[PDB]
Amino acid sequence: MKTVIQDTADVYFKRKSDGKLVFTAEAQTASFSQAISEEKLRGGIGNKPLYILKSEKEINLTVKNAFFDLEWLAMTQGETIQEETKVKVFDREHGLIVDDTNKVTLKGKPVSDVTFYNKKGLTYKIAVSTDGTYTIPTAFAAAKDKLTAVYQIEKVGRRLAIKASKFSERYEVEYRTIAYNPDTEEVYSDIYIQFPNVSPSGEFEMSLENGNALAPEIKFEALADTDTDEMAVVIEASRDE
Amino acid sequence: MKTVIQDTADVYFKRKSDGKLVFTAEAQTASFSQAISEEKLRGGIGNKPLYILKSEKEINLTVKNAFFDLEWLAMTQGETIQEETKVKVFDREHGLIVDDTNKVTLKGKPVSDVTFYNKKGLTYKIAVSTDGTYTIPTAFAAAKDKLTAVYQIEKVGRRLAIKASKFSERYEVEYRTIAYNPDTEEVYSDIYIQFPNVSPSGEFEMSLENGNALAPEIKFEALADTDTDEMAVVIEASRDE
Amino acid sequence: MKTVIQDTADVYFKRKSDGKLVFTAEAQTASFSQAISEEKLRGGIGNKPLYILKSEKEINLTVKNAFFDLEWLAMTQGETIQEETKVKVFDREHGLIVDDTNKVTLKGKPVSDVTFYNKKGLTYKIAVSTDGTYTIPTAFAAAKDKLTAVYQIEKVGRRLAIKASKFSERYEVEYRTIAYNPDTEEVYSDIYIQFPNVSPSGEFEMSLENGNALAPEIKFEALADTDTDEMAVVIEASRDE
Amino acid sequence: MKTVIQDTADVYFKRKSDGKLVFTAEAQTASFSQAISEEKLRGGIGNKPLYILKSEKEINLTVKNAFFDLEWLAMTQGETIQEETKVKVFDREHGLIVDDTNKVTLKGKPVSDVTFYNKKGLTYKIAVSTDGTYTIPTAFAAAKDKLTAVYQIEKVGRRLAIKASKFSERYEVEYRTIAYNPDTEEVYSDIYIQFPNVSPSGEFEMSLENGNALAPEIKFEALADTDTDEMAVVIEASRDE
Amino acid sequence: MKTVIQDTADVYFKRKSDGKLVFTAEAQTASFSQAISEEKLRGGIGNKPLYILKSEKEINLTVKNAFFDLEWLAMTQGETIQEETKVKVFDREHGLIVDDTNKVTLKGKPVSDVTFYNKKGLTYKIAVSTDGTYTIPTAFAAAKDKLTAVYQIEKVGRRLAIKASKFSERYEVEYRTIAYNPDTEEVYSDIYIQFPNVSPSGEFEMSLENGNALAPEIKFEALADTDTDEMAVVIEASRDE
Amino acid sequence: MKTVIQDTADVYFKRKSDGKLVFTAEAQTASFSKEINLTVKNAFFDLEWLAMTQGETIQEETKVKVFDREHGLIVDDTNKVTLKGKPVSDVTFYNKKGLTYKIAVSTDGTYTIPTAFAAAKDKLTAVYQIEKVGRRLAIKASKFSERYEVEYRTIAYNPDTEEVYSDIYIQFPNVSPSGEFEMSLENGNALAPEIKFEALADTDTDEMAVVIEASRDE
Amino acid sequence: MKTVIQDTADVYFKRKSDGKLVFTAEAQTASFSQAIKEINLTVKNAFFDLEWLAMTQGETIQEETKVKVFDREHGLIVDDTNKVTLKGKPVSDVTFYNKKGLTYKIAVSTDGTYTIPTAFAAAKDKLTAVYQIEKVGRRLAIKASKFSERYEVEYRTIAYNPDTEEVYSDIYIQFPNVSPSGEFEMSLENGNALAPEIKFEALADTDTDEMAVVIEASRDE
Amino acid sequence: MKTVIQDTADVYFKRKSDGKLVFTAEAQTASFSQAKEINLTVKNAFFDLEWLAMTQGETIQEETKVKVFDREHGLIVDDTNKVTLKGKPVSDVTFYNKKGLTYKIAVSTDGTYTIPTAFAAAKDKLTAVYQIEKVGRRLAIKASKFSERYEVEYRTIAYNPDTEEVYSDIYIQFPNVSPSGEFEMSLENGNALAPEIKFEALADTDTDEMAVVIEASRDE
């Protein structure tokens, strides 16, 4: 029976050496494409007419999200998110006290507190690299513009390194959506698409624009299962049985 | 004369194998394209183009309906839908309350490993329990907390398998549309386009978006007739004859 | 003097063999584009003379109309339009009611066999009966139910066959537009673009989607004249002379 | 000092053959782009990089105006416009009423073979008559009907020829723009960009859109000056002169 | 925990040779991309791949700011901004009136020839007259006419030079953006994306269009680090630690 | 009946003295050209291919001499540094200036580089020879008496339904290896060794090569 | 066994007479060929070094001497008195070129100023000048005969196992009694590395009569 | 110390009879081969007539009257079967129609000609070929003969692989060299010419040397 489809699909992943499913209920695009490549043999007086064919099939998958999760990053660059790692990053402060005192103070932790970037222009150009308790400026004052101290701070958190590692680990994917019977405006079927033995592709793009949701997008590529030569299965389950 | 077309086309497919005929009165897109390989002959001073070399005349067809029907996308992939088969699908349970004994109770019939998610984003990997009662570790969560569960269940439905196989089935296609008279606003002509000896080339594309119609797409490739070297005919019938 | 051009040119096509004139005063788009082959004479310190090698010139034309005419289809596939040709086209009938003796009445004039569909979806194929009344099996349909019928009828009209033979003939093409005086917005001059030796090209996309006009598009591509070594001429004729 | 740029540039062109100056104060787009590529040397067991070779460079320029003049077209071809040329163009007369004697009167001066169209789309092809009155067959149109005529006339104007063996001339370009202070909202600096030894690339597009404007494009590719090896210089002056 | 990102990032730089921490906190776009390519060896009867060889990664960075600085274009090049340089630029003076004795008064200080433009279009090349006035001929403009003058003049300001030179210096880029909790709205963690060895390459683009937001665009390519064999590190630092 | 030929040919080699069935499943080229010549170009590397062009057997479990380096050593302190290898012949320690110092180290190396030239900061790089086990082939100028028999196999496809239809066997009795050989190692590209043979007429049936088209459906 | 070769071969040299190993690093091309019996060797390195050219040619690389080279001065403006100065130290006749392409040849002047005839160029005109210059540096010479040295050569390569992707074999090729030939090609193309070429001819030894040996080893040994 | 070379030479040639420096080239290839014979081959990317007259002999003659072909394409015949030309011919006029035929006529007092009625009708198009006079340089390729010798200079720059600066300048000097007779001038479609010059290097008549290789330094 003909049905209509008017919504996206819940996406489920699974790793084919363990479990560790990564479910997703907030999704915006679940795309599944198929293409066939053809090589041809030609010859003749009238034209090159086509004689015989050679063929091969490919299946591609694409998932676009609405939230940001670091586990989606770990799929395309297969490694482990190392928890409780101490890391080294930057920080800033923009003006604390008056500029003409021959003594200024800072707060919280210094590590080579350099590039003081004072005044409306020019940096420190000195890079005092001194971490006592209160750092003393020098030379002229050029008072009442800013301080603009740039730090270097050590904190703790997760990590994920990107290296040329040649990930060799497979996945199983499932898409689930609903279909509507266009006579009573009730649901009729659950449409599932199952991909066994898929592989994560290396194509990626992450852009943080001015104002918008990030919307992470990942891509895959489906290969044939070794035992049963299948690539994707479409299933139309009914809700009366 | 110069007519106006402001509507889609009704399509008809007839299988030349046994007898079948399938039509549409609700299509959303009917398209017909032609591609020809053209190169140039280049000559003397300035590399002037003089003659054009043409070959490889191909014709492609594109049909996009407004409903989802499993019999229609089984044409572009040569197989048979196995009705009334059992399969394994994914299932998710939300809103579970844990008592003071670190005990949780599930409802349903899991068949695979059970994965639990907490409110922070951590994973638990318990196996199946006989009586549907699980003991969450104390560090994972405490009393009066909420957890969600993911598992697998079994269902009965239809099943289509996408493989790497040769279809080799042929059809005859007909498009019909209407064309108005621009200076009288009455229907003037009926335009028919006929394709004999077409084949179902595989370039399937399926995209499920966030709150949008699906409009499934099927593509075909038209091949020359072996009796009158035709690939498509165009007919315009006037209602005044 | 500088002017402002805000309009679409009227187009004129003339076949170079006989002199058939096909024009359009209803165009939406008319453009032409140029391309060239560029390379460098370079290499580093030794090849310090860097020079731009320019060779090969390409000129392409595209015209998009707003009405539909079959002469544009006949131009790109060199073939005369057959007129008053008897052909066979599909025709369907909706909403037929089964009587007591399981006999339905068809008011059409079929040529091929008749196919009957019911409301749940099946198919009954029967041969033609002279009186126009067909018996119906008891299992397929019941009394006072609804059915539909599909057959083929005979109609007359124009025809045009798309064969696997490349087109012929060359066309002279002309674009005409007008330009405006900037300071006092009056008409200043007429601008003509002429192409004396131009061949058609096969790039067709006849998409008939619901709710949208057709807007046919035709593509030409230019070759050098054998006497004047020209491809296009641009003429600016003032309206006061 | 950080600035804010919000206008286009004034563009100055100079020809390095005679000393012409072509300037534009109504520009709509002025852009320049860069591109660099490098090669690396590798060897040994494991093709580890051992050296970084010289990096090459290329610069492209694009200019888009808001007016139209034949000089911008003469620049990209290198062919001089020819004043007072006698050309043959097309013309069309509408709404011609036949008399009871099957004769029409033409108010123009037809030169080529005249073409007549009627309200059904039929064509008649009749040579030029001396007295301006023609004879129309009774099968074409009856008395008191409407016909349209297409023919050719002679006109006078200016001529530009786009040949296949003329790519010429070398130029020198300058861009000027302004830059604002982001604190006091006053104009702070004047920015000049100088390109010596440029060559006009052949990339032309004239799109006569429905409505809209023309906005011609002109494209250049930059070379290196022989005396001082420079390709483009950027000068940031200030309002302190 | 899954979060939401809706803002751009800070793009701290730091050269390795000498510490010059270059700052920007008013960015408009910060993007990071990765691509993977691979090669294979073919074999016997079936042209199946035998073993893998030559798989590579490549990471690209793109930064788009909102302000404009000349120390942001000196990063792509390898030259230096030379202060206090005397340069030659064009200048234009509109609306000069020719007096009764065919002379025009000049208010500027040319250092080259003066070009005069009339109201239809023409040229006149005269040399610098030390008196300050110029004698326009009789056939150019008679009296009470408006002319335009174009010179070359002198100015002092900063002067960059875009050459074909060696780009060597490598940088350490770092991004920072904050993420929000979907359930209750406050920041949950900070996201850092530290590239550890980057090399100036790719391209540049300065598009001066008649709206606003020049938005200078810069790109980089990230190469593998020597000591740790890393390319990019993604860090999520929670605000509760 | 007409058929299409697509793929390579598996090559089988067999000596006429006693013969070992050295075979190939992955080859890139199998050509064939009164005289008949044969060329076989592989995709892997096995030492037996170059054991046929030269008449001399492989000698397993030999004892040979080879060079080895240890680049990346810096003097710890005082005067010199010690190795970690097991050298057989003398050692050649030298670095940074393109000049050498030759010595035969008993247990450790100790000598000064003109005081301020290299004392504890300028690292030295050394090279020597060691002892190793493995295989061996010697390319002499004798023992050129051997005969071989080769066979090519490929498949043919039906031009109307596209399944396999027949097998093509090209058999060459009494072939002999010829004297051209070239192994070139370059960066980033595979080896693909090439083996050349020349056919000759058999002394019994006067035949040089036989083409066999064996149908699948019989 | 079925192994795959993917890269080049490390090259080692030895001199028969005294013993001096000049090679410890990477290479670009290593090859040896058999033709009817003759064996030839080809080695292409990645860096140019004059010690390699001292092997293919029989001549000691001459050290610091006085040599005559060429120098070119680009851009000279003719003054009012047609007297052009030079920033160099010409030794022989100085040559001048104009924009059209004519040539002038004038003997050196100790004052440093050269007069320009009116037929060539006027004042404020651009000219180019070339002259001879002496210099200091190394030197090598190519003579006619007397190639009188012999060498020992060794190539080493790593061979991979296609099933598990770990290194399996360390192949070596040893060449005793090899002599440098008279073949030498040196192409200074545009925008590419030179990759200098050294060619060798192999001959049989006396004690073992082995023209060249090929050795295959393993990693479990 | 090991270097890297990435660029071409700055080849100079000088003669011995008079010794004119007519070679200051920006070449694309400058290669030297040895087999005891030594060969040189140099490819520039430009065109100079003085590059020739070196492989050949003789000299470039100046301001000599010549005779070359010229075509006028697209002549329209009037109603009275007359065709009018524009240029000035001196040998003959040959006419071609659009059907593949040929017609001939000699020079007349005026450009007006009388086309035969069987050739073409009125309002047709023809093309014409004839000969005109021009003045310019002229090089003659005679048979055999040789009277010239030369000296050759190749200059390139080396690089330090670790510092990326110029370390040494490599000079290759060729004493007495004689021009060869090998030449290939192919004018393909949409490609540069890149003329080729080959030589033959002999031993020095005094110092008994063929080629000299010199490595200068920037640490002088």
Side-chain angles (χ1 to χ4, degrees), chain A residues 2-3 8 10 12 21 28 30-32 34 42 47 57 174 192 194 229-234, chain B residues 55-56 68-69 77 88 90 92 115 117 155 158-160 162-163 204 206-210 214:
Chain A
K2 312 194 121 34
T3 63
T8 178
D10 291 21
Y12 304 72
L21 319 88
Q28 292 184 356
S31 292
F32 149 51
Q34 166 192 121
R42 324 194 90 106
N47 256 327
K57 215 163 212 182
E174 211 210 75
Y192 309 81
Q194 309 212 121
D229 325 290
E230 293 170 325
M231 311 205 98
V233 173
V234 180
Chain B
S55 192
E56 298 194 56
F68 185 79
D69 163 280
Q77 292 290 284
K88 289 214 292 294
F90 270 137
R92 169 208 314 150
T115 290
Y117 284 82
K155 283 194 133 70
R158 300 218 251 192
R159 178 190 225 268
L160 181 65
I162 276 78
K163 285 205 231 302
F204 199 50
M206 191 166 180
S207 275
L208 299 161
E209 267 73 59
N210 192 54
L214 184 52

Side-chain angles (χ1 to χ4, degrees), chain G residues 4-47:
Chain G
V4 54
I5 274 165
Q6 212 173 229
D7 40 309
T8 89
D10 260 338
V11 196
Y12 298 81
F13 276 81
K14 194 143 171 283
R15 193 102 81 91
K16 298 242 143 31
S17 60
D18 45 354
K20 30 195 293 295
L21 276 39
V22 51
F23 215 142
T24 70
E26 33 78 17
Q28 203 144 30
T29 280
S31 99
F32 89 106
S33 96
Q34 178 177 151
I36 308 205
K37 171 186 277 166
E38 299 290 323
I39 291 271
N40 288 272
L41 293 90
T42 279
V43 165
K44 282 181 177 120
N45 206 6
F47 297 148

Side-chain angles (χ1 to χ4, degrees), chain A residues 26-29 62-70 72-73 204-207 213-219, chain E residues 3-5:
Chain A
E26 31 90 11
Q28 292 184 356
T29 288
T62 307
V63 188
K64 184 152 92 142
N65 205 52
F67 290 166
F68 176 73
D69 184 31
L70 211 53
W72 284 44
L73 258 302
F204 193 41
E205 172 304 318
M206 171 179 202
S207 92
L214 182 74
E217 147 169 335
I218 77 188
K219 312 200 61 75
Chain E
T3 40
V4 172
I5 313 162

Side-chain angles (χ1 to χ4, degrees), chain C residues 15 74 173 184:
Chain C
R15 193 193 303 149
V173 183
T184 83

Side-chain angles (χ1 to χ4, degrees), chain D residues 1-10 12 14 18-25 27-36 38 40 47 52 55 57 59 172 174 176-177 182 190-194 229-238 240-241, chain E residues 23 54 65-70 72-73 76-77 87-92 94 115 117 123 125 148 150 152 154-167 170 199-214 221 223:
Chain D
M1 171 38 146
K2 293 289 199 346
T3 88
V4 171
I5 301 175
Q6 52 175 46
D7 309 19
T8 325
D10 297 17
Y12 299 86
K14 207 165 149 184
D18 63 25
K20 276 179 58 56
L21 226 48
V22 171
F23 77 126
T24 284
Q28 228 177 318
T29 292
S31 166
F32 97 84
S33 42
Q34 196 178 242
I36 39 185
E38 332 92 320
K40 273 203 250 162
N47 37 295
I52 292 131
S55 34
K57 212 169 225 157
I59 281 186
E172 141 187 333
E174 193 165 283
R176 173 198 164 270
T177 195
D190 288 324
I191 288 159
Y192 303 92
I193 317 180
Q194 269 152 2
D229 186 88
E230 279 178 348
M231 297 176 22
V233 301
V234 186
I235 303 168
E236 180 195 7
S238 34
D240 272 354
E241 314 225 26
Chain E
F23 183 40
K54 196 173 302 299
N65 209 19
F67 274 20
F68 170 85
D69 194 0
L70 205 43
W72 228 261
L73 189 34
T76 54
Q77 284 63 230
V87 304
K88 268 182 192 175
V89 317
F90 286 93
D91 183 315
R92 169 171 26 119
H94 274 259
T115 317
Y117 289 56
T123 48
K125 206 160 307 269
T148 294
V150 176
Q152 233 167 354
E154 102 282 328
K155 273 180 155 233
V156 50
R158 334 219 296 177
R159 194 217 186 241
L160 203 55
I162 298 193
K163 274 202 211 193
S165 300
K166 160 180 71 153
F167 332 101
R170 306 311 190 55
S199 95
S201 171
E203 78 150 1
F204 204 88
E205 220 277 353
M206 241 191 299
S207 190
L208 294 83
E209 79 83 6
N210 63 331
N212 48 282
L214 171 77
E221 275 134 10
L223 285 192

Side-chain angles (χ1 to χ4, degrees), chain A residues 128-139:
Chain A
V128 78
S129 305
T130 315
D131 316 308
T133 320
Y134 309 127
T135 64
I136 307 296
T138 168

